[PDB]
């Protein structure tokens, strides 16, 4: 997950055509992550190792 | 901001039966089960007693109950006597990002 | 039980401002959030704003911004709210209340978990 909940600002670029930046952040800036359970990752390696 | 309809006052004799209420609005509660409710006492520091919606901190008698559908929670209440009498509040998530609170209420619980 | 205290009672001129306090122990004070609320007299109270002890980041309330600003030191490691143009209707009791557990990995600041709050820092204005 990325728990900001950014949102998105408008901007136009020349003639017709746009692109889009981040806002303002609501809430608490905390950081971005990912989770694995380390007794299923181990046991993954401890199989691989056995091989 | 919104301040939640609280019904000013529901009461009757000890023993009764009563349902504290707060209605908002579709975006507040629709998406979050923050709520905790508290208590004021002639001027004493607040007490508090459930939160996330249904839950009970510690020493709580469980008379006190939540309930929840959609735009609106509830204090459920049943058995009643003249120390329950407080001014109940409901606050609970109100947005980007910070909470808001209703218009209070008293159970002018009678004697 | 954890120990919890604001500035006692104070007293200003209308339009001034103000810098209540709060000094908490018992827990370190980088744990949990604070929140500040303002209990009106006879009527529905109203939500000022959130402390993050740990970082510079502030939200206060829709209706309060600009009104209101709230900052914290480390060196003393105690936190002040401040709240410009008073008038003698909001006189109110001004409670400092501690908020959620602080995680890195997701946000808690809003969440209403409010298991301790201040003593209660009553503030009336006169000319
Ligand atoms: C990816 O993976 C990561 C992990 O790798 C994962 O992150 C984890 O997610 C968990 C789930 O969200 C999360 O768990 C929460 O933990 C909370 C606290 O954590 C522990 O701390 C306390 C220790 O207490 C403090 O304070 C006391 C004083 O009170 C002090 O004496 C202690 O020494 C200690 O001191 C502090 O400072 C120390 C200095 O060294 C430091 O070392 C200590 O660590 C501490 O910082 C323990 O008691 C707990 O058991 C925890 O083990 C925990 O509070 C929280 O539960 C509450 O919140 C839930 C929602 O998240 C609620 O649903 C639930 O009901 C709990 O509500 C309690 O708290 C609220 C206030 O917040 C209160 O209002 C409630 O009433 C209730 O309180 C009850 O107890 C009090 C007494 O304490 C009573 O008075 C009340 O009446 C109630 O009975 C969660 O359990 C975990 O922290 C997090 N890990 C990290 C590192 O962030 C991540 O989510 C993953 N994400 C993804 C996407 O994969
Ligand atoms: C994560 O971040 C997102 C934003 O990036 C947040 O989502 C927004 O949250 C705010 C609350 O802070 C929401 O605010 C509401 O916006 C409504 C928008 O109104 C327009 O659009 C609707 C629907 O299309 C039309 O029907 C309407 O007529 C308008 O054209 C407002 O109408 C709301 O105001 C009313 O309700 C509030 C209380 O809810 C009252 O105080 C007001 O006076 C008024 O009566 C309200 O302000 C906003 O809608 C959300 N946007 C999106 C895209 O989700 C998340 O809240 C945030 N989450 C967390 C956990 O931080
Ligand atoms: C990133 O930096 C930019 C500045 O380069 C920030 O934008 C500026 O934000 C300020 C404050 O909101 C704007 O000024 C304000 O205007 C209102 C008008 O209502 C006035 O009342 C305020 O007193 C204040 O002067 C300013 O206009 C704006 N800059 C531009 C070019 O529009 C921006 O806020 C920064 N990003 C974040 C997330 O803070």
Redesign the pocket.
Known sequence: ?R?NNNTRKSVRIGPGQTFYATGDIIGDIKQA???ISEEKWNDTLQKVGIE | LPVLTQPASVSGSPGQSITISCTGTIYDVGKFDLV?WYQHHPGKAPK?LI??VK?????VSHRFSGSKSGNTASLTISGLQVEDEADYYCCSFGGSAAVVCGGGTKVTVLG | Q?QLVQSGAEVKNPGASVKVSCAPS???FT??YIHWVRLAPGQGLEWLGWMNPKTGRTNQGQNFQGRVTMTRDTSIGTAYMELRSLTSDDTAVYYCV?????????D?SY?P???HWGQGTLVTVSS
């Not at chain 3, 501690?98 to 997701?106: C, K, L, M």
Request: net charge negative; glycine share 8%.
């Open positions: 997950t728990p992550h990912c989770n | 905790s508090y939160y996330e839950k009970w901190p510690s020493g | 954890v018992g827990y370190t744990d949990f501690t908020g959620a557990w602080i995680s890195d990995y997701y808690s969440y978990n409010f298991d």
